[PDB]
DNA sequence: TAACAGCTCTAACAGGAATA
RNA sequence: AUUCCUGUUAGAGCUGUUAAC
C-alpha cells in the first residue's frame, strides 16, 4: 500500500479567548509584543489567544483591555482555509500541545516547526526506537552528535511538523530531517546531511517515521487517537485529538 | 479515519521505436530496435560540424570518436545499457566534418571571454558560424565546444550564454549541440555518449523515440514563466510549449511566447485567449484544419478566473478543456508498504480532494533494470532515497484522474535532451520553461514559434 | 498601500551519480 | 552547457486579514 506522512486531526472546533482592545492593534504590534513579553500563551490577530488570562493581562495593560470573552471557531478546517492567521494559530496550538509533556526540543526553521531530539536527553529509553531505525545493520545508531568535519556544528534527528488543509480535512505532516543546531550554519552540514540521509531508503524511512510517531504520541499508530492539549492549567485551552496512524491507501 | 481514497498506478509509458517497437527503457529499446525515425530517412546521415578554439578541437575529435566507438557503463549500471557506437545504434553514419566543415572560433572570442562579456562572447561565437551559414546543406548539427577558460561568461546576473547562443542560432535554422568540459570529464562514458548521441540524432533530423499509443486528437499546452530582474521592479516572461502527434509521422514539439510586460505569471483574458488562439491554429495546421477534441493546459501556478474564461472562450463546446496546475513542492511524501525495499512505484497517484491529486512522476520503475532483472530502479536514488510526488490541481475537471495522470506521466519520457529514464515534470512545462529562459534572455523571439530541436 | 500570514514559484549556486 | 534533480540561499508573485489613505 501507500503510507503518507499525514496524521489526521479529527478535532473540528477549538475554544479561544478574545481580548477586546480600546485602541486598534496591528498584527505586527501583537507579534512584537509577543517577543518582548514572552508569555506562556499563543496569540494571533484576526485578538485571539490560547492560554491563561494572566499572561494576556501581562501583555496588555488593563487600560487597553476592555473585555475578555470566548471565541468559538466552529469549523476549524474551513476557518484555517479562509485565514492564514488562523492556519498559523492552529498549527502553533497543535505543535504546543504536541511537544508539551515531552523532552523533545521545539525549534523553528523558516516558519516550519521541528521536534528535535535533545542532545542532553539523547540516551533516553523512548529514543531507543529511533536509535535502532537510524542504526546500521541491526546495531544501535546515534540521533545526536557533532558534524564530522565541522568546527562547532552539531546535528540531531528532527521531524518537521506542518499543518495541512486538504479539502475539509486537517493533517499533521511529518518529515524526518536532520536539525543543525546553528540554523544559519546549516549549509555547512550539506555533505554530512547528504551522507547521513543517502541510504535512508523506503525501509529505513518507514522505521524512522514509525519511531518519530512513537516519540511524538507515546503510541504506535494502531487504534489510537491520542488527545493532546496545550495549556491544560488555563482558562482558555485547546484540546486536539490526532489519529496516531498516518494517512494511507490501498490501490484499486 | 486515516484511509484516503484508493490510489491508482499508471503503467510505465511505452516508447515507440523503429517500426512501432515499444520499450519502456529508452536506451535499451534504442539499442535493440533503432530510432522511431529510422524506418524513414529523416537523417540520411548525421553530418557534424566543429566550432571550437584551435587548441580544443582535439576534444571535439575525441568525443566524436567515443561516439563512434562502443562504451561500457560505469556509474548507474543499474539502468544504463552498453553503448554500441553511433552507426550501430542509430543505423545512420556519424559523418565527421571535412576541413571546410570545421571552423575555428576567433581569438576575439577568447579576448571577450577574458573580458568577461558574455553578450559579446555570444556575438563572436555566432559570427564564427558565418562560414557554416553558407554551408548549411553540408552539415546537420554544429558541435560547439565551450572551454573552461570561458567559465566567466557561462552564467552571471542577467545573462545566459547557452540560451543566448541558441537564440541567436534559432532563426538561422542550424541546430547546435554545445559541449562543455562536463561531458568530457564525467567518469561514466556511456552516460555522456548516450546523451550526446541521442541529442545529435534528435537535432540532426529527429525522433529518437516517440510515445506508444498516443492520441493524435489531443494538444498539450504548458505555460511556464521566467523572471527578469529589473532595476526598478521585475518582468515575467510566460511562454507556451505545445506537444502533439500530428497526422504526419513527425512528432510535434514547439514553443512560442505568450505575448508587452507582465508583473505576475498570470495571463489576462485577452492574453490567455490570444495565446490559445495561436495554439489551436498551430494544432490545426498540423491536423488538416481539425479542431482539438481535448486541450491539456499545464501551468506551474494557478489559473485565475479570467484565465479560465479565456481558456473556455478560446475553444468551442466540442473541445474538452483540462486546466491543470502542477505543484512541484508539496508536503506529502509516500512510503511503499506490503515497508518495501524500494520506494513507491512510479506512476502511482493518490487523489487528495475532488480537485487535488498527488502524482508520483518519480519512483521505482520495474522492467527497466539491466543488472539483476526483477529489481526496481529508482532514478533519483543518488539524490533522494524516496520520491517526492507532484500535486495536480484541476481548474476544469469533469472527473477521473487517470487521463490527466497518464498524460503528465507520458509527457515525462519524450525529453530527448534528458539522458536519464524520465523527468519529474512534463515536457510541456520543461520546454515552456526553457523557452521562457531563452525569451527572457533575448526579447526579439516573440514573433516566431520554434521546434524543440533548436533549444534542446 | 503598508504590514501580517500562507502557498508556491523562480533564481542562483553546490554537487554527486541509482539498495550502498 | 550530454544529463538528472537534490539541497542551500534569497526573492517575487498571488491570495487573504487588518489598518488605513
Ligand atoms: Mg542539449
XYZ file of C-alpha atoms (C1' of nucleotides) and ligand atoms in Angstrom:
750
model
C 0.000 0.000 0.000
C 0.899 3.695 0.194
C 1.611 5.227 3.604
C 1.778 9.012 3.663
C 3.244 11.332 6.305
C -0.154 12.831 7.208
C -1.813 12.214 10.577
C -5.498 13.222 10.639
C -6.660 15.947 13.015
C -10.204 14.890 13.878
C -10.710 17.934 16.124
C -13.363 20.090 14.460
C -13.698 23.113 16.768
C -11.496 24.771 19.391
C -12.361 27.346 22.038
C -10.247 30.517 22.032
C -10.092 33.728 24.068
C -10.918 37.164 22.685
C -9.460 40.321 24.194
C -11.278 43.458 23.045
C -8.952 46.452 22.832
C -9.651 50.121 23.499
C -7.402 51.011 20.544
C -6.825 49.393 17.141
C -3.934 46.936 17.032
C -1.720 45.638 14.227
C -0.605 42.026 13.849
C 2.980 43.307 13.734
C 2.434 45.070 17.065
C 0.932 41.918 18.570
C 3.782 39.699 17.378
C 6.479 42.096 18.602
C 4.772 42.392 21.993
C 4.743 38.580 21.992
C 8.525 38.552 21.602
C 9.046 41.268 24.214
C 6.838 39.802 26.955
C 7.493 36.106 26.185
C 4.135 34.911 27.574
C 3.063 31.334 28.204
C 0.318 31.713 25.615
C -0.248 31.745 21.861
C -1.572 34.936 20.273
C -2.892 35.875 16.846
C -4.695 38.906 15.443
C -7.792 38.418 13.307
C -7.112 39.400 19.088
C -7.331 35.656 19.719
C -5.312 33.796 22.339
C -4.843 30.320 23.767
C -3.558 30.011 27.309
C -4.132 31.770 30.615
C -5.774 35.134 31.184
C -2.925 36.342 33.483
C -0.396 36.175 30.632
C -2.701 38.219 28.394
C -3.014 40.722 31.236
C 0.785 40.941 31.310
C 0.823 41.548 27.549
C -1.914 44.215 27.560
C -2.380 46.616 30.455
C -5.833 46.986 31.987
C -6.186 50.418 30.358
C -6.076 48.952 26.837
C -8.146 45.854 27.722
C -11.916 46.293 27.505
C -13.199 42.727 27.909
C -12.033 39.119 27.648
C -14.580 36.674 26.243
C -14.599 33.371 24.396
C -14.302 32.673 20.668
C -15.806 29.562 19.083
C -14.089 28.506 15.861
C -16.848 26.087 14.880
C -15.263 24.923 11.598
C -11.521 24.725 12.212
C -10.707 23.398 8.727
C -12.829 25.999 6.930
C -11.534 28.789 9.175
C -7.867 27.931 8.621
C -8.551 27.601 4.891
C -10.088 31.084 4.918
C -7.478 32.732 7.164
C -3.711 32.331 7.043
C -3.624 33.838 10.538
C -5.986 31.100 11.715
C -3.880 28.493 9.912
C -0.721 29.667 11.685
C -2.518 29.942 15.038
C -3.992 26.435 14.890
C -0.707 24.950 13.661
C 1.180 26.541 16.558
C -1.504 25.399 19.006
C -1.250 21.799 17.806
C 2.552 21.972 17.986
C 2.498 23.326 21.548
C 0.022 20.620 22.558
C 2.230 18.007 20.875
C 5.560 18.971 22.460
C 4.245 19.829 25.936
C 4.758 16.804 28.208
C 7.795 15.553 26.278
C 11.541 16.296 26.423
C 11.569 16.987 22.673
C 13.149 20.284 21.685
C 10.873 22.667 19.778
C 12.633 24.579 17.001
C 11.542 26.703 14.041
C 13.383 26.963 10.716
C 11.983 29.434 8.185
C 8.407 29.145 9.531
C 8.319 25.347 9.882
C 8.140 23.755 13.326
C 10.534 20.939 14.226
C 10.533 18.412 17.047
C 14.265 17.892 17.595
C 15.969 15.206 19.674
C 17.716 16.821 22.675
C 21.466 16.344 22.913
C 21.325 16.077 26.709
C 18.439 13.570 26.655
C 19.657 11.574 23.639
C 20.219 8.342 25.596
C 16.637 8.198 26.906
C 14.611 4.992 26.754
C 11.981 6.485 24.434
C 14.704 7.220 21.851
C 15.905 3.612 21.536
C 13.493 3.006 18.652
C 14.920 5.994 16.771
C 18.438 4.743 17.532
C 17.503 1.374 16.025
C 15.855 2.976 12.983
C 18.921 5.113 12.218
C 21.349 2.327 13.127
C 23.407 0.342 10.640
C 22.996 -3.410 10.065
C 20.945 -4.006 13.201
C 23.194 -2.248 15.722
C 22.406 0.946 17.651
C 22.978 4.239 15.852
C 23.056 7.832 17.027
C 20.393 10.536 16.899
C 22.594 13.429 18.045
C 26.224 14.317 17.543
C 28.825 16.603 16.031
C 29.160 17.188 12.299
C 32.095 15.093 11.142
C 34.291 17.801 9.587
C 32.867 20.893 11.309
C 34.478 23.031 13.998
C 31.411 23.628 16.186
C 28.416 22.405 14.156
C 26.047 19.980 15.878
C 23.314 17.741 14.491
C 20.287 15.845 15.750
C 17.388 13.895 14.302
C 14.312 16.102 13.983
C 10.856 15.884 12.469
C 9.252 18.823 10.697
C 5.592 19.093 11.708
C 3.305 21.058 9.391
C -0.421 21.771 9.360
C -2.030 20.981 6.007
C -5.564 21.922 4.954
C -6.760 19.432 2.325
C -10.401 19.747 1.330
C -12.310 19.718 4.592
C -9.593 17.865 6.495
C -6.595 18.859 8.599
C -3.358 16.880 8.503
C -0.181 16.841 10.566
C 2.637 16.396 8.046
C 5.764 14.765 9.488
C 9.037 14.940 7.566
C 12.120 13.359 9.196
C 15.018 15.796 8.900
C 18.445 16.390 10.388
C 18.373 19.533 12.506
C 21.617 21.510 12.645
C 21.980 23.312 15.969
C 23.222 26.594 14.428
C 20.425 27.400 11.987
C 22.351 29.914 9.869
C 25.277 27.460 9.567
C 23.129 24.530 8.399
C 24.598 24.934 4.904
C 27.967 23.862 6.322
C 26.448 20.436 7.067
C 25.323 19.858 3.471
C 27.642 16.906 2.862
C 27.043 15.473 6.335
C 23.252 15.541 5.947
C 23.571 14.150 2.420
C 25.717 11.209 3.538
C 23.510 10.560 6.574
C 20.290 10.611 4.520
C 21.777 8.864 1.452
C 20.724 5.298 2.284
C 17.541 6.084 4.255
C 15.541 4.191 1.652
C 11.907 3.078 1.889
C 12.508 0.606 4.741
C 14.747 2.843 6.857
C 12.463 5.838 6.323
C 9.421 3.791 7.340
C 11.221 2.769 10.528
C 12.256 6.379 11.192
C 8.716 7.687 10.675
C 7.308 4.985 12.954
C 9.876 5.908 15.609
C 9.041 9.608 15.318
C 5.302 8.934 15.599
C 6.001 6.819 18.684
C 8.110 9.635 20.146
C 5.502 12.315 19.439
C 2.405 10.369 20.528
C 3.607 7.763 23.049
C 1.947 5.026 20.977
C 2.222 3.342 17.582
C -0.466 4.119 15.006
C -2.765 1.247 15.897
C -6.279 2.071 17.067
C -5.208 5.392 18.541
C -6.478 8.986 18.560
C -4.388 10.325 21.436
C -5.672 13.639 22.789
C -3.003 16.290 23.208
C -3.721 19.587 24.943
C -1.975 22.941 25.176
C -2.098 24.911 28.431
C -4.133 22.348 30.428
C -3.904 24.602 33.516
C -5.506 27.602 31.792
C -8.987 29.029 31.309
C -8.671 29.074 27.501
C -7.069 25.799 26.413
C -7.059 23.887 23.131
C -7.522 20.107 23.211
C -6.736 18.429 19.891
C -7.044 14.747 19.032
C -4.816 13.292 16.310
C -5.008 9.790 14.902
C -1.723 8.049 15.617
C -1.618 6.322 12.214
C -0.595 8.326 9.176
C -2.902 8.565 6.189
C -2.614 5.608 3.836
C -4.394 3.960 0.940
C -4.637 0.614 -0.835
C -4.793 0.598 -4.614
C -7.760 -0.406 -6.727
C -10.147 7.759 9.714
C -6.733 7.965 8.051
C -7.740 5.947 4.973
C -7.724 8.216 1.929
C -9.214 7.436 -1.470
C -7.857 4.339 -3.178
C -4.773 5.205 -5.207
C -4.039 4.004 -8.733
C -0.895 3.234 -10.720
C -0.307 4.393 -14.295
C 1.833 1.829 -16.162
C 5.259 2.920 -17.332
C 4.766 4.779 -20.645
C 5.927 2.630 -23.537
C 8.205 4.358 -26.048
C 7.727 3.852 -29.784
C 10.923 2.950 -31.646
C 11.800 1.871 -35.197
C 8.838 0.182 -36.899
C 6.460 0.519 -33.937
C 8.582 -1.418 -31.447
C 7.576 -0.472 -27.899
C 10.014 -0.327 -24.995
C 9.717 1.479 -21.675
C 13.506 1.688 -21.391
C 14.713 4.314 -23.902
C 18.375 3.340 -24.270
C 17.609 -0.390 -24.238
C 14.869 -0.023 -26.846
C 17.063 2.278 -28.926
C 19.888 -0.265 -28.966
C 17.525 -3.168 -29.671
C 15.398 -1.641 -32.435
C 16.711 1.740 -33.564
C 15.133 5.189 -33.544
C 11.490 5.692 -34.439
C 12.680 7.876 -37.325
C 14.907 5.104 -38.705
C 12.031 3.453 -40.584
C 12.102 6.502 -42.870
C 15.076 8.719 -43.683
C 14.788 11.902 -41.675
C 18.590 11.933 -41.401
C 20.165 10.064 -44.279
C 23.301 10.688 -42.230
C 24.263 12.768 -39.211
C 26.894 15.174 -40.514
C 28.648 17.160 -37.815
C 30.480 20.459 -37.933
C 33.065 21.636 -35.415
C 33.246 25.057 -33.789
C 35.853 25.214 -31.028
C 39.065 27.098 -30.230
C 42.002 25.802 -32.246
C 43.559 24.390 -29.063
C 40.432 22.437 -28.067
C 39.489 20.839 -31.395
C 41.164 17.604 -30.303
C 38.491 17.427 -27.591
C 35.686 17.515 -30.162
C 37.548 14.932 -32.243
C 37.929 12.679 -29.193
C 34.295 12.905 -28.096
C 33.194 12.204 -31.674
C 35.471 9.151 -31.713
C 33.908 7.955 -28.446
C 30.518 8.443 -30.101
C 31.718 6.252 -32.980
C 33.150 3.508 -30.747
C 31.410 1.418 -28.071
C 31.383 2.454 -24.417
C 30.568 0.488 -21.260
C 28.594 1.998 -18.353
C 30.491 2.564 -15.113
C 28.124 4.635 -12.961
C 24.421 3.790 -12.733
C 24.925 0.348 -14.260
C 21.558 -0.413 -12.655
C 19.978 1.358 -15.640
C 22.442 2.279 -18.391
C 22.898 -0.300 -21.160
C 26.017 -0.865 -23.247
C 26.601 1.759 -25.941
C 27.476 0.287 -29.332
C 28.579 3.354 -31.284
C 26.600 5.879 -33.286
C 26.421 3.924 -36.549
C 25.491 0.633 -34.880
C 22.923 2.182 -32.535
C 21.229 4.732 -34.807
C 21.525 2.850 -38.143
C 22.924 6.114 -39.540
C 26.552 7.175 -40.148
C 28.098 9.825 -37.897
C 29.861 11.793 -40.603
C 32.942 13.559 -39.279
C 33.347 17.102 -40.632
C 35.650 17.858 -43.515
C 38.140 20.721 -43.206
C 35.545 23.090 -44.691
C 33.016 21.918 -42.067
C 35.460 22.520 -39.178
C 35.639 26.205 -38.245
C 37.783 27.802 -35.551
C 36.479 30.382 -33.105
C 38.263 33.707 -33.483
C 40.772 34.988 -30.943
C 38.271 37.787 -30.317
C 36.160 35.105 -28.621
C 38.998 34.457 -26.164
C 39.571 38.183 -25.698
C 35.950 38.979 -24.853
C 35.761 35.854 -22.684
C 38.745 37.030 -20.640
C 36.997 40.422 -20.579
C 34.008 38.627 -19.035
C 31.451 39.979 -21.523
C 29.110 37.145 -22.430
C 27.000 39.454 -24.587
C 29.925 39.934 -26.974
C 31.062 36.328 -26.478
C 27.773 35.045 -27.905
C 28.001 37.525 -30.791
C 31.531 36.387 -31.639
C 30.596 32.708 -31.290
C 27.710 33.100 -33.742
C 29.984 35.145 -36.026
C 32.348 32.155 -36.045
C 29.471 30.291 -37.746
C 29.465 32.665 -40.740
C 31.190 30.134 -42.984
C 28.792 27.440 -41.782
C 25.752 29.563 -42.679
C 26.583 29.251 -46.381
C 27.340 25.525 -45.945
C 24.089 24.691 -44.128
C 23.450 21.952 -46.705
C 26.794 20.272 -45.975
C 26.352 19.658 -42.232
C 23.400 18.808 -39.991
C 24.462 19.708 -36.430
C 27.244 22.070 -35.408
C 29.312 20.823 -32.459
C 30.242 23.822 -30.310
C 32.757 23.283 -27.516
C 32.966 25.864 -24.736
C 36.341 25.728 -22.941
C 36.553 26.247 -19.197
C 38.560 29.407 -19.928
C 35.183 30.939 -20.848
C 33.703 29.988 -17.454
C 33.361 33.671 -16.533
C 30.749 34.096 -19.292
C 28.788 30.853 -18.881
C 26.310 32.314 -16.375
C 26.020 35.550 -14.425
C 23.339 38.010 -13.341
C 21.040 38.725 -16.268
C 22.907 36.601 -18.817
C 22.941 33.001 -20.031
C 25.461 32.025 -22.704
C 23.637 28.822 -23.676
C 20.250 30.496 -24.104
C 21.779 33.491 -25.896
C 23.654 31.286 -28.384
C 20.621 29.085 -29.014
C 18.510 32.221 -29.514
C 20.963 33.724 -31.998
C 21.216 30.462 -33.974
C 17.488 29.642 -33.939
C 16.381 31.962 -36.806
C 19.350 30.616 -38.796
C 17.750 27.134 -38.725
C 21.009 25.363 -37.826
C 20.863 23.056 -34.788
C 23.640 23.150 -32.213
C 24.873 20.749 -29.539
C 27.017 22.600 -27.005
C 29.760 20.624 -25.259
C 31.351 21.824 -22.023
C 34.108 20.154 -20.046
C 31.348 18.375 -18.090
C 30.673 15.872 -20.882
C 34.400 15.259 -21.388
C 35.127 14.946 -17.661
C 32.238 12.867 -16.285
C 33.662 9.475 -15.382
C 30.870 7.338 -16.835
C 31.376 7.493 -20.595
C 28.278 5.527 -21.609
C 26.251 8.282 -19.920
C 27.751 11.085 -21.993
C 27.888 9.047 -25.205
C 24.226 8.054 -24.942
C 23.114 11.590 -24.134
C 25.183 13.284 -26.831
C 24.286 10.693 -29.471
C 20.549 10.931 -28.780
C 20.771 14.733 -28.814
C 22.695 14.767 -32.103
C 20.221 12.409 -33.747
C 17.254 14.403 -32.428
C 18.572 17.729 -33.727
C 20.114 16.305 -36.934
C 16.804 15.003 -38.172
C 14.831 13.883 -35.172
C 12.651 11.446 -33.238
C 14.990 9.104 -31.355
C 11.733 7.758 -29.904
C 8.063 8.663 -29.623
C 5.212 7.757 -27.299
C 3.407 4.467 -27.840
C -0.401 4.602 -28.034
C -0.649 8.399 -28.065
C -3.879 10.031 -29.214
C -3.379 12.311 -32.220
C -6.541 14.322 -31.458
C -5.067 15.921 -28.312
C -2.983 19.054 -27.833
C -0.819 19.556 -24.748
C -0.123 23.141 -23.693
C 2.273 24.035 -20.915
C 2.687 27.622 -19.730
C 5.851 28.346 -17.772
C 7.354 31.655 -16.742
C 10.794 33.086 -16.116
C 11.674 36.200 -14.116
C 13.886 39.020 -15.388
C 15.056 41.292 -12.574
C 14.548 44.935 -13.482
C 16.494 47.610 -11.639
C 13.126 49.060 -10.566
C 10.856 46.004 -10.392
C 10.541 42.694 -12.233
C 9.358 41.311 -15.566
C 7.639 37.978 -16.117
C 8.151 36.009 -19.337
C 5.412 33.420 -19.763
C 5.985 31.047 -22.671
C 3.731 28.326 -24.052
C 5.021 24.953 -25.231
C 2.790 22.672 -27.300
C 3.195 18.957 -27.897
C 1.052 16.891 -30.233
C 1.378 13.894 -32.526
C 0.127 15.339 -35.830
C -1.214 13.461 -38.830
C 2.326 13.416 -40.174
C 4.700 10.936 -38.583
C 6.874 13.755 -37.227
C 6.078 14.290 -33.551
C 5.421 17.989 -32.959
C 7.075 19.819 -30.040
C 7.106 23.618 -30.319
C 7.326 26.692 -28.109
C 6.234 30.306 -28.510
C 5.966 33.383 -26.321
C 2.517 34.076 -24.872
C 2.906 37.730 -25.898
C 4.346 43.787 -23.658
C 5.161 43.490 -19.945
C 3.880 41.232 -17.171
C 4.043 41.794 -13.427
C 2.917 38.307 -12.436
C 2.798 34.837 -14.038
C -0.959 35.193 -14.585
C -2.245 35.828 -18.099
C -5.048 38.308 -18.723
C -8.252 37.375 -20.549
C -7.119 38.787 -23.911
C -3.619 37.370 -23.337
C -4.664 33.823 -22.435
C -7.194 33.728 -25.255
C -4.683 35.272 -27.674
C -2.084 32.608 -26.911
C -4.716 29.873 -27.195
C -5.861 31.392 -30.497
C -2.264 30.922 -31.612
C -2.237 27.434 -30.047
C -5.243 25.870 -31.753
C -4.205 27.396 -35.078
C -0.826 25.705 -34.623
C -2.632 22.448 -33.841
C -4.960 22.895 -36.833
C -2.162 23.490 -39.338
C -0.746 20.096 -38.321
C -4.178 18.397 -38.325
C -5.520 19.448 -41.769
C -7.632 22.084 -40.016
C -9.274 19.803 -37.447
C -10.082 21.248 -34.035
C -8.604 19.552 -30.951
C -11.054 17.275 -29.182
C -9.215 17.819 -25.882
C -6.869 20.545 -24.645
C -4.481 19.941 -21.738
C -3.185 23.227 -20.336
C -0.452 22.673 -17.758
C 0.604 25.591 -15.590
C 3.155 25.972 -12.827
C 0.861 28.334 -10.902
C -2.901 28.525 -10.545
C -5.363 29.586 -13.230
C -7.177 32.806 -12.421
C -10.877 33.012 -13.222
C -10.077 35.370 -16.100
C -7.655 32.719 -17.373
C -10.373 30.068 -17.126
C -12.782 32.316 -19.034
C -10.163 32.903 -21.723
C -9.451 29.182 -21.984
C -13.139 28.313 -22.298
C -13.689 31.115 -24.831
C -10.705 30.085 -26.970
C -12.278 26.706 -27.783
C -15.720 25.543 -28.846
C -18.004 23.361 -26.735
C -16.845 20.284 -28.670
C -13.323 20.680 -27.280
C -12.811 19.302 -23.768
C -10.577 21.677 -21.804
C -8.335 20.471 -18.966
C -6.742 23.235 -16.891
C -4.230 21.661 -14.506
C -1.762 23.333 -12.156
C 1.422 21.417 -11.337
C 2.762 21.938 -7.807
C 6.299 20.562 -7.690
C 6.994 21.239 -3.993
C 4.386 19.578 -1.766
C 4.322 18.485 1.870
C 3.100 14.969 1.069
C 5.518 12.087 0.615
C 4.883 8.376 0.431
C 6.227 5.031 1.598
C 5.687 1.692 -0.121
C 4.400 -0.968 2.289
C 3.453 -4.611 1.752
C 7.883 -1.390 4.089
C 9.239 -2.417 0.696
C 12.946 -2.337 -0.077
C 12.282 0.073 -2.964
C 10.018 3.149 -2.782
C 6.535 3.785 -4.153
C 6.228 2.788 -7.796
C 6.495 5.443 -10.474
C 3.101 6.279 -11.910
C 1.303 5.925 -8.578
C -1.213 8.695 -7.962
C -3.355 9.368 -4.893
C -6.392 11.683 -5.167
C -6.491 14.107 -2.242
C -9.647 16.148 -2.909
C -12.032 16.383 -5.846
C -9.600 18.818 -7.491
C -6.304 17.636 -5.960
C -4.084 14.647 -6.711
C -0.549 13.513 -5.890
C 1.240 12.071 -8.921
C 4.485 10.138 -8.464
C 6.412 11.068 -11.587
C 9.425 9.941 -9.544
C 9.522 6.420 -8.175
C 10.590 2.840 -8.652
C 10.329 1.591 -12.246
C 10.086 -2.139 -12.918
C 11.258 -3.964 -16.009
C 13.935 -1.375 -16.790
C 16.738 -2.738 -14.621
C 19.783 -4.004 -16.517
C 21.633 -5.941 -13.818
C 19.575 -8.386 -11.698
C 16.213 -8.011 -13.504
C 13.221 -8.081 -11.192
C 14.782 -5.326 -9.048
C 13.156 -1.876 -9.313
C 15.065 1.206 -10.430
C 14.740 4.486 -8.548
C 16.395 7.028 -10.817
C 16.933 9.742 -8.193
C 18.410 7.299 -5.658
C 21.678 9.240 -5.537
C 19.726 12.456 -4.966
C 16.992 11.330 -2.555
C 16.134 7.944 -1.039
C 12.403 8.457 -1.622
C 10.487 10.135 -4.450
C 8.686 13.414 -3.900
C 5.279 13.468 -5.617
C 3.957 16.426 -7.524
C 0.459 17.805 -6.951
C -2.172 18.276 -9.658
C -4.877 20.901 -9.112
C -7.802 20.811 -11.544
C -9.487 24.087 -12.505
C -11.795 22.396 -15.036
C -12.429 18.800 -14.036
C -15.222 16.512 -15.180
C -13.906 13.590 -13.131
C -11.224 10.928 -13.355
C -7.558 11.471 -12.538
C -6.357 8.632 -14.783
C -6.452 10.607 -18.038
C -4.521 13.628 -16.769
C -2.073 11.483 -14.786
C -1.317 9.279 -17.798
C -0.885 12.381 -19.955
C 1.524 14.005 -17.492
C 3.479 10.775 -16.990
C 3.820 10.009 -20.696
C 4.895 13.635 -21.099
C 7.915 12.968 -18.853
C 9.639 10.475 -21.179
C 9.935 12.346 -24.501
C 12.614 14.827 -23.414
C 15.280 13.741 -25.898
C 17.623 16.176 -24.139
C 17.230 14.049 -20.986
C 19.664 11.131 -20.842
C 18.033 9.547 -17.779
C 14.871 7.445 -17.812
C 12.324 10.214 -17.283
C 11.641 13.699 -15.935
C 9.720 14.750 -12.854
C 7.906 17.387 -14.950
C 6.068 17.060 -18.276
C 7.977 18.134 -21.357
C 5.321 20.801 -21.950
C 6.411 22.575 -18.771
C 10.075 21.687 -19.362
C 10.224 23.243 -22.828
C 7.997 26.184 -21.893
C 10.434 26.953 -19.067
C 13.456 26.532 -21.361
C 11.912 28.795 -23.999
C 10.880 31.264 -21.290
C 14.526 31.460 -20.242
C 15.510 31.888 -23.902
C 12.963 34.676 -24.476
C 13.883 36.431 -21.230
C 17.496 36.335 -22.422
C 16.623 37.607 -25.922
C 13.306 39.501 -26.182
C 13.217 39.526 -30.002
C 11.999 35.924 -30.416
C 8.331 36.575 -29.656
C 7.000 36.554 -33.215
C 8.071 33.074 -34.316
C 7.440 29.612 -32.914
C 10.370 27.222 -32.588
C 10.748 23.447 -32.514
C 12.374 21.664 -29.584
C 15.472 20.681 -31.571
C 16.605 24.324 -31.714
C 16.693 24.744 -27.925
C 17.277 21.246 -26.515
C -0.908 50.864 0.037
C 1.561 49.000 4.481
C 2.316 45.224 7.380
C 0.964 40.339 8.505
C 0.047 35.219 7.242
C 0.354 31.039 3.975
C 1.268 28.805 -0.709
C 4.148 28.129 -4.482
C 7.203 29.742 -7.765
C 11.812 31.156 -9.874
C 16.935 32.407 -9.453
C 21.422 31.195 -8.140
C 24.505 28.335 -6.845
C 26.944 23.326 -4.921
C 27.053 18.826 -6.055
C 27.118 13.651 -6.713
C 25.890 9.562 -9.767
C 20.810 4.864 -8.792
C 19.877 -0.730 -2.019
C 25.365 1.006 -0.805
C 26.087 23.705 -21.349
C 25.365 15.005 -22.523
C 22.168 14.833 -18.186
C 19.222 14.353 -13.765
C 17.090 16.964 -9.582
C 18.592 17.167 -4.651
C 19.937 20.598 -1.145
C 21.292 25.598 0.191
C 20.368 30.586 -0.191
C 17.154 34.507 -1.219
C 13.283 36.722 -3.601
C 8.911 37.603 -6.138
C 4.011 36.894 -7.215
C -0.606 35.507 -5.712
C -4.240 35.359 -2.382
C -6.211 36.923 2.064
C -6.835 39.726 7.275
C -6.353 44.194 9.373
C -5.062 49.192 9.386
C -5.786 52.688 6.538
C -5.180 56.844 2.953
Mg 21.146 19.553 -25.357
